[PDB]
Design an enzyme around this catalytic site. Structure first.
Site, PDB file in Angstrom:
ATOM      1  N   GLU A   1       1.751   3.077  -9.694  1.00 60.74           N
ATOM      2  CA  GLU A   1       1.975   2.442  -8.411  1.00 60.74           C
ATOM      3  C   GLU A   1       3.371   1.836  -8.431  1.00 60.74           C
ATOM      4  O   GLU A   1       3.882   1.481  -9.493  1.00 60.74           O
ATOM      5  CB  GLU A   1       0.924   1.351  -8.216  1.00 60.74           C
ATOM      6  CG  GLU A   1       0.873   0.695  -6.858  1.00 60.74           C
ATOM      7  CD  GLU A   1      -0.340  -0.217  -6.726  1.00 60.74           C
ATOM      8  OE1 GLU A   1      -1.019  -0.446  -7.755  1.00 60.74           O
ATOM      9  OE2 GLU A   1      -0.617  -0.697  -5.604  1.00 60.74           O
TER      10      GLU A   1
ATOM     11  N   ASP B   1      18.982   8.402  -5.968  1.00 61.58           N
ATOM     12  CA  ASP B   1      18.159   7.543  -6.811  1.00 61.58           C
ATOM     13  C   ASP B   1      17.654   8.246  -8.059  1.00 61.58           C
ATOM     14  O   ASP B   1      16.541   7.982  -8.496  1.00 61.58           O
ATOM     15  CB  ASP B   1      16.983   6.977  -6.005  1.00 61.58           C
ATOM     16  CG  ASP B   1      16.260   5.843  -6.727  1.00 61.58           C
ATOM     17  OD1 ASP B   1      16.939   5.062  -7.433  1.00 61.58           O
ATOM     18  OD2 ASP B   1      15.014   5.755  -6.616  1.00 61.58           O
TER      19      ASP B   1
END
Ligand SMILES: CCCn1cc(-c2c[nH]c3ncc(-c4ccncc4)nc23)cn1
EC number: 2.7.11.24
Length: 335
Positions: free
Chosen positions: A21, A137
């Site tokens: 997560e 990223d």
């Protein structure tokens, strides 16, 4: 139904298992009953915030258009039959074994492995840049690997057509242009990130860690040496540029001093990727053609994007974005 949170993907997908997560959402593995294989499923809940809606739609559009061995694809997308009931989106992707972050945290890589991982990263990056896209990223946790050392790039939420500061888990792979908030940065930011990743594979530790961009810049200057005024000719905060120019002089640390056991060809490439000035930084085609990668180099096997990218979403209200996300995911609804 996983960690006290709804993961509503049945009946096609069952036997759920938690993976992780973070800012990207929540990722599980699941048994696909239609394909008789386990898959990965990312749950995303973007509709409250305009910037999350942007990134979700951006990721979906890009990944549905892309098709490349070293780039994660989208297999399926689950969402409610009505736009009013749609609160979550579940993106189904290939299940890989691990990511480079976890691998590097505990495992040693031989030079042959480093070489083949870097090739695959650059081969995928060649495709992405050929589509006129910046990833923006790249980092070890979004390079996915399987048992047989095949590599795939994922996580395109921050991507952009090649023409911040939200929370992120790590800023250590960001080019100096970015964290000096320069406007007018290019494809070369991805090459910097790849250089940082290469350094990390060589030593199993981040090359430019640090608690904020100022601490990171100190790390960078501590290795590359003081930047010249030309290195800092970007449009950037004049007080920030003045601060940098004011620091005590640092000499360059020889790469072989920092990496006494690395392949000398690896270090020659590393050097060309981690150049402060983005204009002087090696480009992905040149990097692929570097002697370090010559045992893998094959221009007839390094495909480029059939349809280079042209979208703008920045300006759109979230309700218009939601509509567009609803429309883009329509093809995956039964039926
Ligand atoms: C910041 C990237 C988050 N993200 C990961 C995925 C993904 C897709 N297919 C996967 N297969 C395996 C794993 C994975 C990772 C670590 N440890 C075990 C398994 N992750 C994925 C998509 N988005």
């Amino acid at each position: 139904m996983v960690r006290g949170q709804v993961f509503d993907v049945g009946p096609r997908y069952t036997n759920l298992s938690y993976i992780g997560e973070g800012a990207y959402g929540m990722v599980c593995s699941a048994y696909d009953n239609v394909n008789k294989v386990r898959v990965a499923i990312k749950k995303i809940s973007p509709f409250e915030h305009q910037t999350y809606c942007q990134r979700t739609l951006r990721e979906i559009k890009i990944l549905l258009r892309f098709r490349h061995e070293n780039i994660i694809g989208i297999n399926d997308i689950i969402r409610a039959p009505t736009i009013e009931q749609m609160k979550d989106v579940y993106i189904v992707q290939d299940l890989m074994e691990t990511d480079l972050y976890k691998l590097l945290k505990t495992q040693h890589l031989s030079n042959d492995h480093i070489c083949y991982f870097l090739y695959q990263i650059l081969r995928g990056l060649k495709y992405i840049h050929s589509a006129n896209v910046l990833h923006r990223d790249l980092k070890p946790s979004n390079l996915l690997l399987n048992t047989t050392c095949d590599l795939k790039i994922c996580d395109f939420g921050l991507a952009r057509v090649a023409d911040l500061t939200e929370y992120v888990a790590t800023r250590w792979y960001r080019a100096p242009e970015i964290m000096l908030n320069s406007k007018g940065y290019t494809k070369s930011i991805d090459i910097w990130s790849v250089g940082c990743i290469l350094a990390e594979m060589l030593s199993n530790r981040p090359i430019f860690p640090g608690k904020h961009y100022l601490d990171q810049l100190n790390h960078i200057l501590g290795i590359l040496g003081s930047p010249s005024q030309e290195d800092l000719n970007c449009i950037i905060n004049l007080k920030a540029r003045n601060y940098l120019l004011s620091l005590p002089h640092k000499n360059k640390v020889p790469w072989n001093r920092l990496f006494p056991n690395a392949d000398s060809k690896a270090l020659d490439l590393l050097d060309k990727m981690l150049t402060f000035n983005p204009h002087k930084r090696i480009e992905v085609e040149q990097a692929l053609a570097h002697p370090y990668l010559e045992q893998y180099y094959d221009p007839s096997d390094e495909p480029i994007a059939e349809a280079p990218f042209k979208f703008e979403l920045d300006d759109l209200p979230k309700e218009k974005l939601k509509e567009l996300i609803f429309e883009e995911t329509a093809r995956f609804q039964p039926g």
